[PDB]
Motif scaffolding. Sequence first.
Motif, PDB file in Angstrom:
ATOM      1  N   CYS A 108       7.507  21.910 -14.436  1.00 28.04           N
ATOM      2  CA  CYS A 108       7.427  22.793 -15.621  1.00 28.04           C
ATOM      3  C   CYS A 108       8.127  22.137 -16.810  1.00 28.04           C
ATOM      4  O   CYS A 108       8.035  22.599 -17.930  1.00 28.04           O
ATOM      5  CB  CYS A 108       8.117  24.101 -15.289  1.00 28.04           C
ATOM      6  SG  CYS A 108       6.988  25.496 -15.560  1.00 28.04           S
ATOM      7  N   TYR A 119       5.326  28.897 -26.098  1.00 27.77           N
ATOM      8  CA  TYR A 119       6.660  29.556 -26.236  1.00 27.77           C
ATOM      9  C   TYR A 119       6.474  31.039 -26.526  1.00 27.77           C
ATOM     10  O   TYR A 119       5.447  31.464 -27.015  1.00 27.77           O
ATOM     11  CB  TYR A 119       7.450  28.921 -27.384  1.00 27.77           C
ATOM     12  CG  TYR A 119       7.794  27.483 -27.040  1.00 27.77           C
ATOM     13  CD1 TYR A 119       7.345  26.917 -25.838  1.00 27.77           C
ATOM     14  CD2 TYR A 119       8.574  26.719 -27.918  1.00 27.77           C
ATOM     15  CE1 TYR A 119       7.676  25.596 -25.518  1.00 27.77           C
ATOM     16  CE2 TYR A 119       8.901  25.397 -27.596  1.00 27.77           C
ATOM     17  CZ  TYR A 119       8.453  24.836 -26.397  1.00 27.77           C
ATOM     18  OH  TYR A 119       8.779  23.534 -26.079  1.00 27.77           O
ATOM     19  N   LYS A 161      13.778  20.273  -9.694  1.00 28.10           N
ATOM     20  CA  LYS A 161      13.637  21.722 -10.020  1.00 28.10           C
ATOM     21  C   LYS A 161      12.723  21.941 -11.235  1.00 28.10           C
ATOM     22  O   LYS A 161      11.762  22.680 -11.162  1.00 28.10           O
ATOM     23  CB  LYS A 161      15.021  22.303 -10.319  1.00 28.10           C
ATOM     24  CG  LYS A 161      15.735  22.642  -9.006  1.00 28.10           C
ATOM     25  CD  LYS A 161      14.845  23.548  -8.152  1.00 28.10           C
ATOM     26  CE  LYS A 161      14.352  22.774  -6.928  1.00 28.10           C
ATOM     27  NZ  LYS A 161      14.859  23.428  -5.689  1.00 28.10           N
TER      28      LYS A 161
HETATM   29  C1  HEC Z   1       7.941  27.032 -15.480  1.00 29.60           C
HETATM   30  C2  HEC Z   1       7.747  27.697 -14.127  1.00 29.60           C
HETATM   31  C3  HEC Z   1       9.343  26.669 -15.922  1.00 29.60           C
HETATM   32  C4  HEC Z   1      10.316  26.163 -15.139  1.00 29.60           C
HETATM   33  C5  HEC Z   1      10.180  25.753 -13.676  1.00 29.60           C
HETATM   34  C6  HEC Z   1      11.458  25.959 -15.997  1.00 29.60           C
HETATM   35  N1  HEC Z   1      11.183  26.312 -17.299  1.00 29.60           N
HETATM   36 FE1  HEC Z   1      12.364  26.197 -18.849  1.00 29.60          FE
HETATM   37  N2  HEC Z   1      10.959  26.946 -19.987  1.00 29.60           N
HETATM   38  C7  HEC Z   1       9.688  27.311 -19.627  1.00 29.60           C
HETATM   39  C8  HEC Z   1       8.954  27.862 -20.747  1.00 29.60           C
HETATM   40  C9  HEC Z   1       7.530  28.401 -20.721  1.00 29.60           C
HETATM   41  C10 HEC Z   1       9.784  27.810 -21.812  1.00 29.60           C
HETATM   42  C11 HEC Z   1       9.455  28.175 -23.259  1.00 29.60           C
HETATM   43  C12 HEC Z   1       9.407  29.674 -23.514  1.00 29.60           C
HETATM   44  C13 HEC Z   1       8.000  30.209 -23.268  1.00 29.60           C
HETATM   45  O1  HEC Z   1       7.856  31.412 -23.132  1.00 29.60           O
HETATM   46  O2  HEC Z   1       7.069  29.419 -23.222  1.00 29.60           O
HETATM   47  C14 HEC Z   1      11.025  27.247 -21.328  1.00 29.60           C
HETATM   48  C15 HEC Z   1      12.128  27.027 -22.108  1.00 29.60           C
HETATM   49  C16 HEC Z   1      13.203  26.265 -21.736  1.00 29.60           C
HETATM   50  C17 HEC Z   1      14.224  25.798 -22.644  1.00 29.60           C
HETATM   51  C18 HEC Z   1      14.301  26.044 -24.142  1.00 29.60           C
HETATM   52  C19 HEC Z   1      13.004  25.701 -24.856  1.00 29.60           C
HETATM   53  C20 HEC Z   1      13.228  24.496 -25.754  1.00 29.60           C
HETATM   54  O3  HEC Z   1      12.642  24.453 -26.822  1.00 29.60           O
HETATM   55  O4  HEC Z   1      13.986  23.619 -25.372  1.00 29.60           O
HETATM   56  C21 HEC Z   1      15.099  25.096 -21.904  1.00 29.60           C
HETATM   57  C22 HEC Z   1      16.353  24.399 -22.408  1.00 29.60           C
HETATM   58  C23 HEC Z   1      14.612  25.134 -20.544  1.00 29.60           C
HETATM   59  N3  HEC Z   1      13.444  25.854 -20.448  1.00 29.60           N
HETATM   60  C24 HEC Z   1      15.238  24.528 -19.486  1.00 29.60           C
HETATM   61  C25 HEC Z   1      14.810  24.574 -18.184  1.00 29.60           C
HETATM   62  C26 HEC Z   1      15.506  23.951 -17.080  1.00 29.60           C
HETATM   63  C27 HEC Z   1      16.799  23.153 -17.147  1.00 29.60           C
HETATM   64  C28 HEC Z   1      14.784  24.216 -15.975  1.00 29.60           C
HETATM   65  C29 HEC Z   1      15.125  23.794 -14.554  1.00 29.60           C
HETATM   66  C30 HEC Z   1      16.533  24.049 -14.048  1.00 29.60           C
HETATM   67  C31 HEC Z   1      13.648  24.999 -16.407  1.00 29.60           C
HETATM   68  N4  HEC Z   1      13.669  25.217 -17.764  1.00 29.60           N
HETATM   69  C32 HEC Z   1      12.666  25.467 -15.572  1.00 29.60           C
HETATM   70  C33 HEC Z   1       9.155  27.129 -18.372  1.00 29.60           C
HETATM   71  C34 HEC Z   1       9.880  26.742 -17.262  1.00 29.60           C
END
Ligand code: HEC
Length: 104
Positions: free
Chosen positions: A17, A48, A13
Motif C-alpha cells: 500500500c 486521498y 507492512k
Molecule cells: C492500504 C491498505 C494502506 C496501508 C497498508 C497503509 N496505508 Fe498509509 N495511507 C493509505 C492511504 C489511502 C492514505 C491516504 C489517505 C486516503 O484516504 O487515501 C495513507 C496515508 C498515509 C500517510 C499520510 C499521507 C501522506 O501524504 O504522506 C502516511 C504517513 C502513511 N499512510 C503511512 C503508512 C505507514 C507507515 C504504513 C505501514 C505501517 C501505512 N501507511 C499503511 C493507505 C495505506
Amino acid sequence: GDVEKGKKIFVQKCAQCHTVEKGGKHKTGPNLHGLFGRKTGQAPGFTYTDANKNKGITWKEETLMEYLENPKKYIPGTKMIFAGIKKKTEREDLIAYLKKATNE
Ligand code: HEC
C-alpha cells in the motif's frame, strides 16, 4: 533511525500500500513521495480523503511516529487502516528508512 531496518518494516507492512523503493506509484496504496518533505498530500489525483489529498502537515517523526501507530489517529478522515507497526522502536526505523528510501 535505520535504513535496512525500516527497509524491512516498510516492505513487510506498508509494501502493498506504500511504494518507495519500488517506484512510488499509487499501487494498491499511496507511495511515500510526501514523507519527510513538508508536503503531505503529494499528488491528490490518487484517492486521498478530504484531508491528506491537499493536507498541510508533514511527515517527520511526531507526524509519522504518530500516524504509524494508527492511521486514522493522525486523521480519521483518511481512507486507510492498518495497525501493524504501531509499537514504536520499529516505527522509527520505518520513518528514517523511508526518508532516504524514496530519496532514490
Ligand atoms: C492500504 C491498505 C494502506 C496501508 C497498508 C497503509 N496505508 Fe498509509 N495511507 C493509505 C492511504 C489511502 C492514505 C491516504 C489517505 C486516503 O484516504 O487515501 C495513507 C496515508 C498515509 C500517510 C499520510 C499521507 C501522506 O501524504 O504522506 C502516511 C504517513 C502513511 N499512510 C503511512 C503508512 C505507514 C507507515 C504504513 C505501514 C505501517 C501505512 N501507511 C499503511 C493507505 C495505506
